[PDB]
Short mmCIF file of C-alpha atoms in Angstrom, two decimals:
data_model
loop_
_atom_site.label_atom_id
_atom_site.label_comp_id
_atom_site.label_asym_id
_atom_site.label_seq_id
_atom_site.Cartn_x
_atom_site.Cartn_y
_atom_site.Cartn_z
CA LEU A 1 -5.29 -49.56 17.30
CA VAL A 2 -3.73 -47.98 20.15
CA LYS A 3 -0.75 -47.16 18.41
CA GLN A 4 -2.83 -44.65 16.18
CA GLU A 5 -4.03 -43.30 19.23
CA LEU A 6 -0.42 -42.98 20.74
CA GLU A 7 0.69 -41.54 17.21
CA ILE A 8 -2.34 -38.76 17.48
CA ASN A 9 -1.20 -38.01 21.18
CA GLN A 10 2.53 -37.53 20.13
CA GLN A 11 1.25 -35.23 17.29
CA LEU A 12 -0.91 -33.08 19.35
CA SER A 13 2.16 -32.79 21.84
CA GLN A 14 4.62 -31.65 19.30
CA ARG A 15 2.07 -29.16 17.87
CA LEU A 16 1.50 -27.83 21.20
CA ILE A 17 5.11 -27.33 22.09
CA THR A 18 5.94 -25.83 18.54
CA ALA A 19 2.67 -23.48 19.40
CA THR A 20 3.82 -22.46 22.69
CA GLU A 21 7.41 -21.43 21.38
CA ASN A 22 6.21 -19.62 18.56
CA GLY A 23 3.73 -17.97 21.17
CA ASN A 24 6.80 -17.18 23.69
CA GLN A 25 8.47 -15.70 20.58
CA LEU A 26 5.83 -13.39 19.66
CA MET A 27 5.05 -12.49 23.29
CA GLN A 28 8.85 -11.19 23.44
CA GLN A 29 8.61 -9.40 20.10
CA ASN A 30 5.04 -7.92 21.26
CA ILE A 31 6.86 -6.97 24.39
CA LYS A 32 9.82 -5.06 22.68
CA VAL A 33 7.14 -3.49 20.18
CA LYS A 34 5.33 -2.17 23.17
CA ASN A 35 8.32 -0.60 24.88
CA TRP A 36 9.41 1.06 21.61
CA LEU A 37 5.61 2.32 21.16
CA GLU A 38 5.74 3.88 24.68
CA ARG A 39 9.12 5.35 23.99
CA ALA A 40 7.79 6.81 20.75
CA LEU A 41 4.75 8.00 22.03
CA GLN A 42 6.53 9.85 24.69
CA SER A 43 9.03 11.16 22.51
CA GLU A 44 6.27 12.49 20.06
CA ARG A 45 4.27 14.17 22.86
CA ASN A 46 7.77 15.65 24.01
CA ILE A 47 8.42 17.02 20.42
CA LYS A 48 4.85 18.26 19.81
CA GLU A 49 5.18 20.26 23.29
CA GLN A 50 8.72 21.67 22.17
CA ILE A 51 7.69 22.80 18.51
CA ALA A 52 5.02 24.50 20.70
CA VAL A 53 7.46 26.63 21.96
CA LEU A 54 10.52 26.04 20.06
CA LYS A 55 9.55 28.40 16.86
CA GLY A 56 12.46 29.73 14.83
CA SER A 57 15.29 27.67 16.00
CA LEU A 58 18.01 26.59 13.61
CA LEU A 59 19.64 23.82 15.78
CA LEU A 60 16.05 22.49 16.10
CA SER A 61 16.40 21.05 12.84
CA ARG A 62 19.54 19.22 14.08
CA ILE A 63 17.26 18.03 17.39
CA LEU A 64 14.47 16.74 14.67
CA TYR A 65 17.04 14.95 12.99
CA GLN A 66 18.24 13.01 15.91
CA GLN A 67 14.62 12.43 17.12
CA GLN A 68 13.86 11.20 13.29
CA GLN A 69 17.23 8.79 13.59
CA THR A 70 15.94 7.64 17.12
CA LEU A 71 12.71 6.48 15.53
CA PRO A 72 12.39 2.87 15.06
CA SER A 73 11.90 1.36 11.53
CA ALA A 74 8.08 0.37 11.49
CA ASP A 75 8.43 -1.48 8.04
CA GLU A 76 9.74 -4.71 9.88
CA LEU A 77 6.22 -5.19 10.81
CA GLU A 78 4.87 -8.49 9.91
CA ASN A 79 1.23 -8.61 8.92
CA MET A 80 0.35 -12.21 10.54
CA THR A 81 -3.54 -11.36 10.38
CA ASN A 82 -3.57 -14.58 8.00
CA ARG A 83 -1.65 -16.46 10.93
CA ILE A 84 -4.45 -15.31 13.26
CA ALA A 85 -7.02 -16.35 11.25
CA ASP A 86 -5.10 -19.89 11.02
CA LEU A 87 -4.94 -19.82 14.79
CA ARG A 88 -8.63 -18.95 15.13
CA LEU A 89 -9.24 -22.06 12.37
CA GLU A 90 -7.23 -24.37 14.43
CA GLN A 91 -8.66 -23.59 17.40
CA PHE A 92 -11.98 -24.17 16.17
CA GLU A 93 -11.03 -27.65 14.85
CA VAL A 94 -9.80 -28.41 18.23
CA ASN A 95 -13.02 -27.65 19.73
CA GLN A 96 -14.56 -29.65 17.22
CA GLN A 97 -12.49 -32.69 17.80
CA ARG A 98 -12.84 -32.20 21.92
CA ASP A 99 -16.74 -32.32 21.56
CA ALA A 100 -16.33 -35.57 19.22
CA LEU A 101 -14.23 -37.02 21.95
CA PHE A 102 -16.50 -35.66 24.97
CA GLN A 103 -18.13 -38.75 25.56
CA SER A 104 -15.01 -41.18 26.07
CA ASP A 105 -17.43 -44.18 26.40
CA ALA A 106 -19.25 -43.50 23.16
CA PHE A 107 -16.26 -42.82 20.95
CA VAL A 108 -14.77 -46.13 22.62
CA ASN A 109 -17.54 -47.87 21.37
CA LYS A 110 -17.37 -46.53 18.03
CA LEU A 111 -14.04 -47.16 17.60
CA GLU A 112 -14.74 -50.66 18.60
CA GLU A 113 -16.71 -51.60 15.92
CA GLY A 114 -15.72 -53.77 13.38
CA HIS A 115 -12.90 -54.66 15.43
CA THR A 116 -14.07 -57.23 18.41
CA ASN A 117 -11.64 -59.75 17.27
CA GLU A 118 -8.68 -57.63 18.53
CA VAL A 119 -10.59 -55.88 21.35
CA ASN A 120 -10.50 -57.29 24.61
CA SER A 121 -11.23 -56.25 28.49
CA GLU A 122 -7.76 -54.35 28.64
CA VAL A 123 -8.08 -52.81 25.12
CA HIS A 124 -11.10 -50.81 25.99
CA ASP A 125 -9.53 -49.52 29.08
CA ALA A 126 -6.28 -48.72 27.39
CA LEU A 127 -8.44 -46.68 24.25
CA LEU A 128 -10.48 -44.99 27.05
CA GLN A 129 -7.21 -43.79 28.68
CA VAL A 130 -5.63 -43.02 25.58
CA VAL A 131 -8.89 -40.85 24.61
CA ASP A 132 -9.03 -39.18 27.76
CA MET A 133 -5.22 -38.19 27.40
CA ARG A 134 -5.91 -37.11 23.81
CA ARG A 135 -8.47 -34.94 25.10
CA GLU A 136 -6.60 -33.31 27.62
CA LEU A 137 -3.90 -32.51 25.45
CA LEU A 138 -6.27 -31.10 23.11
CA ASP A 139 -7.49 -29.18 25.66
CA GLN A 140 -4.36 -27.73 26.70
CA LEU A 141 -3.17 -27.30 23.23
CA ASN A 142 -6.30 -25.12 22.70
CA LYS A 143 -6.07 -22.90 25.77
CA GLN A 144 -2.42 -22.11 24.27
CA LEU A 145 -3.70 -21.34 21.06
CA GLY A 146 -6.10 -19.25 22.39
CA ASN A 147 -3.73 -17.30 24.78
CA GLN A 148 -1.31 -16.99 21.65
CA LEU A 149 -4.10 -15.63 19.56
CA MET A 150 -5.18 -13.09 21.89
CA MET A 151 -1.46 -12.07 22.39
CA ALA A 152 -1.01 -11.76 18.67
CA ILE A 153 -4.31 -9.74 18.53
CA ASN A 154 -2.87 -7.26 21.17
CA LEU A 155 0.40 -7.29 19.22
CA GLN A 156 -1.18 -6.47 15.91
CA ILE A 157 -3.26 -3.93 17.41
CA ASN A 158 0.14 -2.42 19.14
CA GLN A 159 1.95 -2.78 15.71
CA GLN A 160 -0.78 -0.78 13.76
CA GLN A 161 -0.88 2.01 16.38
CA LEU A 162 3.16 2.36 16.31
CA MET A 163 3.13 2.27 12.65
CA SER A 164 0.32 5.02 12.39
CA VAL A 165 2.43 6.91 15.24
CA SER A 166 5.50 6.60 13.11
CA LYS A 167 3.65 8.14 10.23
CA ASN A 168 2.13 10.90 12.23
CA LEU A 169 5.74 11.60 13.52
CA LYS A 170 6.85 11.55 9.91
CA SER A 171 3.93 14.15 9.33
CA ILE A 172 4.94 16.22 12.22
CA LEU A 173 8.66 16.26 11.33
CA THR A 174 7.86 17.67 7.99
CA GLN A 175 5.39 19.95 9.18
CA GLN A 176 8.06 21.59 11.55
CA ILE A 177 10.09 21.47 8.52
CA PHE A 178 7.90 23.11 6.15
CA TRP A 179 8.72 26.73 6.79
CA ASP A 180 33.29 28.13 4.31
CA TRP A 181 30.25 26.16 3.32
CA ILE A 182 32.29 24.92 -0.08
CA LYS A 183 35.58 24.41 2.12
CA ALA A 184 33.43 22.12 4.51
CA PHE A 185 31.89 20.50 1.44
CA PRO A 186 35.12 19.13 0.29
CA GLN A 187 35.64 17.17 3.19
CA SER A 188 31.76 15.97 2.98
CA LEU A 189 32.21 14.84 -0.25
CA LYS A 190 34.01 11.87 1.15
CA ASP A 191 31.27 10.75 3.64
CA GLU A 192 28.72 11.18 0.63
CA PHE A 193 30.55 8.93 -1.42
CA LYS A 194 30.72 6.54 1.54
CA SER A 195 27.09 6.66 1.97
CA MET A 196 26.37 5.91 -1.58
CA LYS A 197 27.78 2.36 -1.02
CA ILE A 198 4.75 -9.77 -14.17
CA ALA A 199 7.18 -7.36 -15.01
CA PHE A 200 8.67 -9.44 -17.83
CA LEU A 201 4.92 -9.81 -19.31
CA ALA A 202 4.52 -6.16 -19.00
CA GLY A 203 8.01 -5.81 -20.74
CA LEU A 204 6.93 -8.29 -23.52
CA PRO A 205 3.45 -6.41 -24.23
CA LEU A 206 5.10 -3.07 -24.26
CA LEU A 207 7.98 -4.59 -26.88
CA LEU A 208 5.10 -5.66 -29.19
CA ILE A 209 3.21 -2.45 -28.87
CA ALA A 210 6.24 -0.39 -29.52
CA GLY A 211 6.91 -2.90 -32.77
CA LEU A 212 3.14 -2.41 -33.72
CA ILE A 213 3.40 1.26 -33.23
CA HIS A 214 6.10 1.83 -35.67
CA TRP A 215 3.89 0.99 -38.54
CA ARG A 216 1.10 2.66 -36.53
CA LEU A 217 3.07 5.82 -36.33
CA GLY A 218 4.20 5.23 -40.09
CA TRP A 219 0.70 5.13 -41.13
CA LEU A 220 -0.43 8.17 -39.00
CA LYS A 221 2.25 10.37 -40.29
CA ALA A 222 0.98 9.46 -43.71
CA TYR A 223 -2.20 10.19 -43.09
CA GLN A 224 -1.26 13.56 -41.40
CA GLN A 225 0.56 14.49 -44.64
CA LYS A 226 -2.09 13.41 -46.61
CA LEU A 227 -4.62 15.90 -44.34
CA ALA A 228 -2.04 18.73 -44.07
CA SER A 229 -1.20 19.06 -47.67
CA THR A 230 -2.46 23.04 -39.35
CA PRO A 231 -4.85 22.31 -36.46
CA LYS A 232 -5.01 18.47 -38.14
CA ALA A 233 -1.26 18.07 -38.14
CA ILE A 234 -0.96 19.50 -34.69
CA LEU A 235 -3.55 17.02 -33.35
CA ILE A 236 -1.59 14.07 -35.12
CA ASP A 237 1.70 15.07 -33.72
CA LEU A 238 0.18 15.30 -30.23
CA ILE A 239 -1.64 11.90 -30.69
CA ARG A 240 1.73 10.36 -32.21
CA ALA A 241 3.78 11.86 -28.83
CA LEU A 242 1.25 10.40 -26.60
CA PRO A 243 1.56 7.02 -27.61
CA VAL A 244 5.42 6.94 -27.49
CA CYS A 245 4.96 8.69 -23.66
CA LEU A 246 2.48 6.01 -22.86
CA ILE A 247 4.97 3.23 -24.15
CA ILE A 248 8.11 4.64 -22.19
CA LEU A 249 5.94 4.98 -19.22
CA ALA A 250 4.94 1.55 -19.29
CA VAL A 251 8.21 0.35 -19.94
CA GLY A 252 9.42 2.31 -16.91
CA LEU A 253 6.77 0.82 -14.51
CA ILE A 254 7.75 -2.60 -15.68
CA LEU A 255 11.13 -1.62 -14.73
CA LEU A 256 9.99 -0.43 -11.43
CA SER A 257 12.98 0.78 -6.27
CA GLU A 258 10.44 3.29 -4.39
CA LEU A 259 12.49 6.10 -6.22
CA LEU A 260 11.95 4.83 -9.67
CA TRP A 261 8.25 4.76 -9.43
CA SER A 262 8.13 8.47 -8.68
CA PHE A 263 10.62 9.30 -11.03
CA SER A 264 8.73 7.78 -13.75
CA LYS A 265 5.50 9.31 -12.56
CA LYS A 266 7.36 12.69 -13.27
CA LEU A 267 9.23 11.29 -16.33
CA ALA A 268 6.20 10.95 -17.81
CA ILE A 269 4.84 14.22 -18.15
CA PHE A 270 8.59 15.48 -18.70
CA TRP A 271 8.91 12.99 -21.96
CA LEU A 272 5.73 14.59 -22.98
CA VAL A 273 6.98 18.25 -22.55
CA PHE A 274 10.18 16.92 -24.01
CA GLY A 275 8.34 15.38 -27.27
CA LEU A 276 5.95 18.38 -27.34
CA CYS A 277 9.11 20.03 -29.32
CA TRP A 278 10.14 16.97 -31.22
CA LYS A 279 6.57 16.54 -32.61
CA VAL A 280 6.22 20.30 -33.30
CA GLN A 281 13.33 28.54 -35.80
CA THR A 282 11.42 25.32 -35.34
CA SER A 283 14.21 23.34 -36.54
CA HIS A 284 16.74 25.48 -34.45
CA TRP A 285 13.74 24.97 -31.67
CA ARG A 286 14.24 21.20 -32.33
CA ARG A 287 17.99 20.95 -31.63
CA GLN A 288 17.75 23.50 -28.65
CA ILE A 289 15.22 21.73 -26.69
CA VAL A 290 17.91 19.09 -25.93
CA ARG A 291 19.56 21.29 -23.61
CA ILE A 292 15.96 22.36 -21.78
CA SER A 293 15.13 18.50 -21.72
CA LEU A 294 18.70 17.57 -19.81
CA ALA A 295 18.15 20.68 -17.44
CA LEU A 296 14.59 19.16 -16.63
CA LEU A 297 16.21 15.86 -16.15
CA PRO A 298 18.58 16.73 -13.53
CA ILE A 299 16.05 18.77 -11.70
CA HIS A 300 13.87 15.44 -11.99
CA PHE A 301 16.49 13.58 -10.51
CA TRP A 302 17.42 16.17 -7.73
CA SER A 303 13.54 16.72 -6.88
CA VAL A 304 12.18 13.14 -7.05
CA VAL A 305 13.07 12.18 -3.33
CA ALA A 306 11.25 15.59 -1.92
CA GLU A 307 7.96 14.72 -2.08
CA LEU A 308 8.45 11.52 -0.42
CA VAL A 309 24.20 19.44 0.20
CA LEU A 310 25.83 17.42 -2.40
CA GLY A 311 22.71 17.02 -4.34
CA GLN A 312 22.51 20.84 -4.66
CA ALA A 313 26.09 20.88 -6.35
CA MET A 314 24.76 20.21 -9.74
CA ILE A 315 21.33 22.70 -9.16
CA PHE A 316 23.75 25.48 -8.23
CA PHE A 317 25.41 25.65 -11.50
CA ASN A 318 22.01 24.87 -13.36
CA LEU A 319 20.58 27.97 -11.75
CA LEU A 320 23.30 29.96 -13.11
CA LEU A 321 22.93 28.17 -16.77
CA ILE A 322 19.11 28.69 -16.64
CA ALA A 323 19.42 32.48 -15.52
CA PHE A 324 22.37 32.69 -18.43
CA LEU A 325 19.78 31.14 -21.07
CA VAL A 326 16.93 33.30 -19.48
CA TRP A 327 19.08 36.37 -20.37
CA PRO A 328 19.33 35.98 -24.20
CA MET A 329 15.58 35.68 -24.42
CA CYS A 330 15.02 38.72 -22.11
CA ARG A 331 17.46 40.97 -24.28
CA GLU A 332 15.70 39.82 -27.40
CA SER A 333 12.25 40.61 -25.67
CA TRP A 334 13.80 43.67 -24.53
CA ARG A 335 14.34 45.01 -27.94
CA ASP A 336 10.55 45.31 -28.50
CA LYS A 337 8.55 47.71 -26.28
CA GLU A 338 5.22 48.05 -28.27
CA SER A 339 4.82 44.26 -28.83
CA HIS A 340 3.09 42.23 -26.26
CA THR A 341 5.20 40.62 -23.40
CA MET A 342 2.61 38.40 -21.55
CA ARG A 343 5.15 35.44 -21.57
CA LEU A 344 7.73 37.62 -20.29
CA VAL A 345 6.25 37.43 -16.72
CA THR A 346 6.31 33.62 -16.46
CA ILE A 347 10.00 33.75 -17.54
CA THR A 348 10.81 36.41 -15.03
CA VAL A 349 9.44 34.39 -12.23
CA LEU A 350 11.25 31.29 -13.38
CA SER A 351 14.40 32.93 -13.49
CA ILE A 352 13.85 34.97 -10.04
CA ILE A 353 13.38 31.33 -8.83
CA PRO A 354 16.63 30.06 -10.49
CA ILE A 355 18.35 33.06 -8.51
CA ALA A 356 16.48 32.67 -5.27
CA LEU A 357 17.22 28.97 -5.30
CA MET A 358 20.89 29.36 -5.68
CA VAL A 359 21.03 32.52 -3.43
CA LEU A 360 19.02 31.80 -0.27
CA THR A 361 20.12 28.04 0.02
CA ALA A 362 23.38 28.82 2.07
CA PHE A 363 15.12 27.82 6.11
CA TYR A 364 17.09 25.32 3.77
CA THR A 365 13.84 24.22 2.36
CA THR A 366 14.00 26.91 -0.74
CA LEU A 367 14.65 24.00 -3.48
CA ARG A 368 10.94 23.06 -2.65
CA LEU A 369 9.45 25.65 -4.72
CA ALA A 370 11.13 24.33 -7.72
CA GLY A 371 8.80 21.73 -8.01
CA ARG A 372 6.08 23.97 -8.21
CA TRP A 373 7.93 26.22 -10.73
CA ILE A 374 8.60 23.79 -13.11
CA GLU A 375 5.01 22.66 -13.17
CA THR A 376 4.02 26.57 -13.78
CA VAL A 377 6.13 26.42 -16.46
CA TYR A 378 4.98 23.52 -18.06
CA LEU A 379 1.23 24.87 -17.60
CA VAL A 380 2.44 28.19 -19.22
CA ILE A 381 3.55 26.17 -22.27
CA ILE A 382 0.83 24.28 -22.55
CA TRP A 383 -1.61 27.30 -22.34
CA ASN A 384 0.49 29.09 -25.09
CA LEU A 385 0.40 26.30 -27.43
CA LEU A 386 -3.64 25.85 -26.77
CA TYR A 387 -4.07 29.59 -27.28
CA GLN A 388 -2.24 29.27 -30.57
CA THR A 389 -4.47 26.51 -31.65
CA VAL A 390 -7.47 28.14 -30.60
CA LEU A 391 -6.80 31.07 -32.57
CA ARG A 392 -6.12 29.09 -35.54
CA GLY A 393 -9.26 26.98 -35.31
CA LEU A 394 -11.19 30.16 -34.61
CA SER A 395 -9.58 31.71 -38.08
CA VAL A 396 -10.22 28.68 -39.95
CA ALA A 397 -13.87 28.66 -38.67
CA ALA A 398 -14.39 32.28 -39.39
CA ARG A 399 -13.12 32.00 -42.69
CA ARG A 400 -15.38 29.28 -43.42
CA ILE A 401 -18.44 31.09 -42.03
CA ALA A 402 -17.38 34.06 -44.24
CA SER B 1 -12.23 -18.65 4.60
CA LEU B 2 -12.24 -21.62 2.28
CA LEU B 3 -11.78 -24.16 4.74
CA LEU B 4 -14.92 -22.51 6.40
CA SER B 5 -17.03 -24.28 3.87
CA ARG B 6 -15.72 -27.41 5.25
CA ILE B 7 -16.53 -26.57 8.75
CA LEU B 8 -19.90 -25.29 7.63
CA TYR B 9 -20.28 -28.93 5.85
CA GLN B 10 -19.37 -30.59 9.05
CA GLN B 11 -21.75 -28.52 11.37
CA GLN B 12 -24.71 -29.43 8.87
CA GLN B 13 -23.27 -33.13 9.25
CA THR B 14 -23.77 -32.53 12.89
CA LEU B 15 -27.43 -31.37 12.52
CA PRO B 16 -29.86 -33.73 13.74
CA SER B 17 -32.81 -34.63 11.31
CA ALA B 18 -36.09 -32.78 12.37
CA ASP B 19 -38.34 -34.57 10.04
CA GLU B 20 -38.85 -37.68 12.62
CA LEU B 21 -40.90 -35.07 14.67
CA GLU B 22 -44.02 -37.08 15.41
CA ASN B 23 -47.22 -34.24 15.02
CA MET B 24 -48.92 -35.75 17.95
CA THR B 25 -51.24 -32.67 18.27
CA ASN B 26 -54.00 -35.02 17.54
CA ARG B 27 -52.97 -37.22 20.36
CA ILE B 28 -53.09 -34.26 22.54
CA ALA B 29 -56.63 -33.53 21.78
CA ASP B 30 -57.37 -37.09 22.53
CA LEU B 31 -55.83 -36.85 25.87
CA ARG B 32 -57.78 -33.76 26.54
CA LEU B 33 -60.88 -35.18 25.70
CA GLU B 34 -60.29 -38.64 27.79
CA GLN B 35 -59.10 -36.43 30.78
CA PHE B 36 -62.53 -34.25 30.61
CA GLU B 37 -64.39 -37.68 30.23
CA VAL B 38 -62.50 -38.92 33.24
CA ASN B 39 -63.62 -35.53 35.04
CA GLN B 40 -67.26 -36.28 34.00
CA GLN B 41 -67.01 -39.65 35.16
CA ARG B 42 -65.55 -38.97 38.66
CA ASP B 43 -68.25 -36.18 39.00
CA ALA B 44 -71.15 -38.82 38.30
CA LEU B 45 -69.34 -41.18 40.80
CA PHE B 46 -68.42 -38.19 43.36
CA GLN B 47 -71.64 -39.07 45.54
CA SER B 48 -70.80 -42.71 46.34
CA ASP B 49 -74.14 -43.25 48.23
#
């Protein structure tokens, strides 16, 4: 009888010791986090004051880079809110146990029931003393746990505030950053090189979807050929391109790695644009679109991490290549004067962007406009295709009405 | 909180049974009538002589 009480008391003491050690570690971590958060708040206020008066300062970019490098990483925060609920439940359980053991005499009388053959005058006193000691230890552990829970709640509030502050600091750095060299780059090349050094279920369903979609697309192509011999053929080609794009996007998502997710998000539209030519001279265009797709892919790779000087080395040549490719089209367009040149304006804007990106990058945020330029080009192409389809449909409807 | 179901079960088990209440309001009326009768008897016996 007394052995069980002694074992329970020992278990309670061990639990209290472990909880106290965890509370001390958490308090130390919370104090370190609070110190870092105060430092960050002071630094953010200082940076805001400076940017209020440090307008148009190239070296201020270096200062902002240093400040960002000084910012601590908030990703190491442990969302122990579940542990906080566990502590609250443990405290409630301890309170319930203490309330059950509040009446030491009643508890001893209840425990002595059906055990009078092993209970004596000394046994009752020993049981009462053990119950009192267990109650005292439970009260001490409950107080320690409540103090630890308060400290953890304060730490969680401080950690949330510090994460918000770091996010706001990143936002402010971006807002401030919003608005010879090659010889130095030879040495920086080595530095850059040194700097370099459910999913299975989704993948299998994607494989089965593609396996079925092979025959589905065969049947769809047969149906499209039967219907055409065209707006119907164009719609069928668009639908066929859409299923392949969806399958590729699902495969990429299963394969995704933060940069990979945004890369696939852009690659959805990129592959849609690429397959628009595959599903729709046209034969000459079907072979010449490979260069455009490859150029978009390097641009996608160089601009994926933007929205979230080595990287511009490929872009410097890509801009010149795009300008050279547009030059033959402009020369062909320049041969016609009375003909409409509505699409030349978009081509001229795209070429100006390729020239500006490679010219003004020698303040350095000129590469940001490329993301909008690519989207504008894609929108213009989609608008032209939709206009052609609408013209064909209107002609068909007018012929039918006549 | 799934375990909160166990806590609620314990709390309900701790609740005492109110069905054992004795609605002695009739006994209260009987006591009031007895007190009125005693007052009447005392008033009748107020003048000892």
